[PDB]
């Protein structure tokens, strides 16, 4: 009956020692008749108990969305440990077990390059600065924008795309007021990946050279 989905820790969260990474176990199609879900967490086959039990969410299709969240400790997710979730419920003949771990294989650093505003864009009220992040592995990556030491949160980063070479590429687009770009303000592009030095790289772009 119910379906189980196991989600990895937010890429930013696994890369900064100053964050709360957590694996997430989601159970959709839980009956209004048998709502209880017992969760069992395993870490490299060893049962852990620290999991956080989250209150069920009534979905509009008259079913519940039960979730459990196990916090990971950085040095474990990046070090390829296997996080197993065992979902037990009355409406299941036998428990559902799901497993997640970071993608194995040679870590490859991303390469960044920037795109200043377009020929048409520069005639509009708002302009867009873009970032191209190519050839990183695994797809676990954080793309943020910041200007003058302050977070610039009006951007859209595309989801990682696989290449014929076996690595990923994405595109980030920050949209800002034309007036700000013309004033020669300097906007940067932050990329976080396990293969970068100090897990981070940044690429600035302005009206100036």
Ligand X SMILES: *[C@@H]1O[C@H](CO[C@@H]2O[C@@H](C)[C@@H](O)[C@@H](O)[C@@H]2O)[C@@H](O[C@@H]2O[C@H](CO)[C@@H](O[C@@H]3O[C@H](CO[C@H]4O[C@H](CO)[C@@H](O)[C@H](O)[C@@H]4O[C@@H]4O[C@H](CO)[C@@H](O[C@@H]5O[C@H](CO)[C@H](O)[C@H](O)[C@H]5O)[C@H](O)[C@H]4NC(C)=O)[C@@H](O)[C@H](O[C@H]4O[C@H](CO)[C@@H](O)[C@H](O)[C@@H]4O[C@@H]4O[C@H](CO)[C@@H](O)[C@H](O)[C@H]4NC(C)=O)[C@@H]3O)[C@H](O)[C@H]2NC(C)=O)[C@H](O)[C@H]1NC(C)=O
Residues lying near its own copies in the complex (CB under 8 A): 108-109, 111-115, 118-120, 130, 132, 134-135, 156, 158, 161, 163-165, 169, 171, 173
Query: Are β-strands 168-177 and 126-136 bridged in parallel, bridged antiparallel, or unpaired?
Result: antiparallel
Taking the complex as a whole, the smallest distance from the CB of residue 129 to its own copies amounts, in Å, to: 10
Residue 62 Cβ vs ligand X, minimum distance, rounded to whole Å: 8
Question: What are the tokens at 18?
Answer: 């100053």
Q: What is the DSSP letter of 34?
A: S
Q: Judged by CB under 6 A, does residue 14 bind ligand X?
A: no
Instruction: Establish whether the linkage from the previous residue to 138 is cis, with ω within 30° of 0.
Output: yes
| Residue 9 · residue 21 · CB < 8 Å | yes
Nearer to its own copies, 173 or 178 (CB): 173
Q: How far is the CB of 54 from ligand X (least distance, A)?
A: 9
Closest CA to 153 of 207, 106, 190: 190
CB of 175 to ligand X, least distance (A): 21
Binds ligand X (CB under 6 A): choice among 2, 11, 13, 181: 13
User: Which of 15, 26, 78, 196 forms a contact with ligand X (CB under 6 A)?
Assistant: 26
Contact 69, 52 (CB under 8 A): yes
Stretch that binds ligand X, among 9-17, 88-96, 178-186, 193-201 (CB under 6 A): 9-17
111-123 in b/e form (b: 16+ CB < 10 A) is: ebebeebeeeeee
User: 122 by DSSP, 3-state: which?
Assistant: helix
- Residue 165 contact partner, candidates ligand X, its own copies, none, CB within 5 to 8 A by sort of partner: its own copies
Q: Contacts with ligand X in 60-79 (CB under 6 A)? A: 60-61, 63, 65
- The candidate with the shortest Cα–Cα distance to 110, out of 170, 172, 152, 164, is 170
Residue choice 11, 24, 39, 83 for contact with ligand X (CB under 6 A): 24
DSSP 100-120: E-PPPS--B--EEEEEPPPTT
158 makes contact with ligand X (CB under 6 A): no
Task: Enumerate binding residues for ligand X (CB under 6 A).
Answer: 3, 5, 7, 9-10, 13, 21-22, 24, 26, 28-29, 59-61, 63, 65
């Amino acid at each position: 009956g119910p379906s189980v989905f196991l989600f990895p820790p937010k890429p930013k969260d696994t890369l900064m020692i100053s964050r709360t990474p957590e694996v997430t176990c989601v159970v959709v199609d839980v009956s209004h008749e048998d709502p209880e879900v017992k969760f069992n967490w395993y870490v490299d086959g060893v049962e852990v108990h620290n999991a956080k039990t989250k209150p069920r969410e009534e979905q509009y299709n008259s079913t519940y969305r039960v979730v459990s969240v196990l916090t990971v400790l950085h040095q474990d997710w990046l070090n390829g440990k296997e996080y197993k979730c065992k979902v037990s419920n009355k409406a299941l003949p036998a428990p559902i077990e799901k497993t997640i771990s970071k993608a194995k294989g040679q870590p490859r650093e991303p390469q960044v390059c920037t795109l200043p505003p377009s020929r048409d864009e520069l005639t509009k009220n708002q302009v867009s600065l873009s970032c191209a992040v190519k050839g990183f592995y695994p797809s676990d990556i954080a793309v943020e924008w910041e200007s003058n030491g302050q977070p610039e949160n009006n951007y859209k980063t595309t989801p990682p795309v696989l290449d014929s070479d076996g690595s990923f590429f994405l595109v980030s687009k920050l949209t800002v007021d034309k007036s700000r770009w013309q004033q020669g303000n300097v906007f940067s592009c932050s990329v976080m990946h396990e293969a970068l030095h100090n897990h981070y790289t940044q690429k600035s772009l302005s009206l100036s050279p």
